[PDB]
């Protein structure tokens, strides 16, 4: 169990850790989050009480270093930093724990929600989508645009998701126009899986990361990427059986975790209707179709 200590909390803020969240008051004696499960990526996220605009946060893995949060009154945000002095860090954490100034990561023993949302998500892949090579953790916020959104404007602050475009020379072999447009199997299997992602695990990791950025930060480009990666599979007549069964599990947990009140902005009617009722895979996503029909029948 690892710990992310906070130097202090000088401004009133709602703090997220994965799917959990806590309100902290201005100058409340809050000194961080303990008992964080080892083995998963995590995200620590913030929404200021005085500006409920710019949700922002940090993806990290406590196996990669000792991380803490410190408010910067110049840039006006809670920043993640790495402590390189192990003994200083262990001594800070032990003091704050003894004074019980830390919230405990509130995981229920039965509850595999976070594993299920991050099964294929790797910190080394996050650091290629979010480029800031001097840090081992990755900053994301509500406003960051994607490489794809930028083509259609600061490159250093972009989400480098894999570009997916159904009406692109990459997606369509000369001579197979109708075939490739109506059946995206060559784009999915040859271009994306064999070519770019190398395997289904990296494709799912990016799909799961895009969803979590959409949900936690209201990041619109991330929502676009999540739906594009779902539609590319559902629009392929030829998908390995293990990938379809895994996608059904992935989407089931995503739809299960989504706040009911955000379905209107986080779910694209066209994509979900097409994926569940018209696509090659309309009958391959049993779990997802059942939770969508019971939780969001209006969208459908």
């Amino acid at each position: 169990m690892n710990t992310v200590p906070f130097t202090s909390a000088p401004i009133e803020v709602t703090i997220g850790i994965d799917q959990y969240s806590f309100n902290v008051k201005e100058n409340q004696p809050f000194h961080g989050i303990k008992d964080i499960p080892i083995g998963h990526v995590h995200v620590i996220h913030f929404q200021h009480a005085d500006n409920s605009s710019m949700r922002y946060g940090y993806w990290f893995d406590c196996r990669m270093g000792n991380f803490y949060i410190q408010y910067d009154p110049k840039d006006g945000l809670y920043k993640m930093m790495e402590e390189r002095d192990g003994a200083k860090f262990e001594n800070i954490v032990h003091n704050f724990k003894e004074r019980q100034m830390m919230v405990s990561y509130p995981k229920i023993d039965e509850d595999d929600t976070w594993y299920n949302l991050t099964e294929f998500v790797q910190m080394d892949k996050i650091r290629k989508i979010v480029r800031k090579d001097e840090n081992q953790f990755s900053y994301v916020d509500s406003s960051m645009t994607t490489v794809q959104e930028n083509e259609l404007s600061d490159p250093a602050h972009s989400l480098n998701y894999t570009v997916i475009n159904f009406k692109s020379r990459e997606a369509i072999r000369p001579g197979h126009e109708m075939e490739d447009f109506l059946d995206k199997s060559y784009y999915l299997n040859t271009v994306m899986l064999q070519g770019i992602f190398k395997n289904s695990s990296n494709y799912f990791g990016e799909l799961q990361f895009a969803f979590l950025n959409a949900m936690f930060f209201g990041n619109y480009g991330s929502s676009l990427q999540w739906h594009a990666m779902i539609e590319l599979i559902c629009s392929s007549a030829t998908v390995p059986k293990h990938m379809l069964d895994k996608l059904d599990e992935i989407l089931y947990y995503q739809i299960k975790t989504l706040p009911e009140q955000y379905s209107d902005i986080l779910l694209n009617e066209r994509v979900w209707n097409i994926c569940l009722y018209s696509s090659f895979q309309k009958n391959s996503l049993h779990n997802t179709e059942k939770i969508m029909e019971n939780k969001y029948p209006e969208l459908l």
Binding site: K167, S168, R169, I172, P174, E177, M178, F181, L182
Partner: protein
């Protein structure tokens, strides 16, 4: 965006453009089988590809052999249309290639965009205009070359005959759309109006009769009367 009543003069500027109409590509007769089921028999069709400024018509004849052993023919027909338009553009010298292709039916946009990915600077546009190009097969010489075809063939016509010697391309297009709208609404009556006087003939190298300027005004009035009559019937007004 969409071509409409508001941006109509754009058709007659000096930017090369083509209309593509796919409504006569896939043509069938529906009939009873021996067992009393229903079946279709394809007949030859055509792509109607028109430069509205010059009257140049690229009539690509679609021979029934292209459907043999294919499924979902109404879907395939849009893709075959887009394949053949793409092939036509690639066959033209660069300075003759269109800057825009206007499709008469919105269902042609994705097929044509995907076939034209190699031409990112050619704009593919829909139209809000309800153009009567489906009636092209009511022009006897066009119907005749399509029905006689024994293999895929491209035939080039000028759909304005020699009208541009005397009138602008705006006026020529308006005359063409009026003639085709009449032919579409009441074919028998429209053809009667066009051929009623035996002394006005169609030149071997033309599609329409050799009307004087005064005869064209009489004809155009007879076509407008035909269309309004038919409308009052359609709608009891």
């Amino acid at each position: 965006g969409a071509m409409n009543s508001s941006n109509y003069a754009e058709l007659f500027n000096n930017d090369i453009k083509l209309f593509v109409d796919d409504t006569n590509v896939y043509r069938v007769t529906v009939h009873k089988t021996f067992e009393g089921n229903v079946a279709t028999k394809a007949i030859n069709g055509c792509i109607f590809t028109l430069n509205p400024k010059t009257g140049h018509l690229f009539l690509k004849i679609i021979h029934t052999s292209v459907w043999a052993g294919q499924k979902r023919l109404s879907q395939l027909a849009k893709w075959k249309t887009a394949e053949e338009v793409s092939a036509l553009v690639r066959s033209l010298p660069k300075e003759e290639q269109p800057k825009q292709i206007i499709v008469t039916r919105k269902a042609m946009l994705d097929p044509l965009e995907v076939h034209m990915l190699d031409f990112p600077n050619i704009a593919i546009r829909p139209t809000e205009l309800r153009l009567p190009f489906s009636a092209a097969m009511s022009i006897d010489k066009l119907s005749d070359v399509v029905m006689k075809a024994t293999e895929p063939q491209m035939v080039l016509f000028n759909i304005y005959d020699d009208w541009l010697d005397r009138i602008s391309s705006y006026t020529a297009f308006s005359r063409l759309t009026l003639l085709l709208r009449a032919l579409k609404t009441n074919e028998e009556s429209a053809k009667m109006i066009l051929l009623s006087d035996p002394t006005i003939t169609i030149k071997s190298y033309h599609l329409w009769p050799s009307f004087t300027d005064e005869q064209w005004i009489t004809i155009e009035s007879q076509m407008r009367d035909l269309i309004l009559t038919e409308y009052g019937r359609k709608y009891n007004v």
